[PDB]
């Protein structure tokens, strides 16, 4: 719905950026998550170890609750840490059964809450 929300969905089903501008949200969101992913690989390694059970079993409701709860007080860099996590979780659950971003709408709602701050971090502060 919002420009940020539309971009999260787009990113979550890796739509593939054409036309990148320094202020294209999808591209810059995408760049921020690839940067977080690489720089915190080992951490995502741990995070997978913790969630393997939920992913192998295809336990959507738990995964959703887990992340929503994580998002509660969240600062912009955890919200983006969370979206990066979710991207990779989405991809992994597809091996099992069709999973797309809508299944996680409420998580997205929590990653995009307080827009100005999240965008502020993406453009100004992410790298």
């Amino acid at each position: 719905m919002s420009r940020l929300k539309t971009a999260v969905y787009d990113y979550l089903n890796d739509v593939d950026i054409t036309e990148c501008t320094e202020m294209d949200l999808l591209c810059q969101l995408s760049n921020c998550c690839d940067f977080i992913n690489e720089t915190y690989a080992k951490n995502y390694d741990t995070l997978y170890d913790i969630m393997e059970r939920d992913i192998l079993s295809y336990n959507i409701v738990n995964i959703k609750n887990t992340l929503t709860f994580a998002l509660r007080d969240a600062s912009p860099s955890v919200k983006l840490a969370t979206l990066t996590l979710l991207a990779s979780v989405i991809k992994k659950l597809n091996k099992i059964q069709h999973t797309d971003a809508a299944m996680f709408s409420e998580v997205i709602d929590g990653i995009v809450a307080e827009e100005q701050q999240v965008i502020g971090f993406i453009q100004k502060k992410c790298k």
Partner: peptide
């Protein structure tokens, strides 16, 4: 549970090496 405390722990960590490390001191 403790599974969801963990994830939460781990996400805060990452976002602390971020929004704290390369931000202000």
């Amino acid at each position: 549970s403790s599974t969801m405390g963990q994830v939460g722990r781990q996400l805060a960590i990452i976002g602390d090496d971020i929004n704290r490390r390369y931000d202000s001191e």
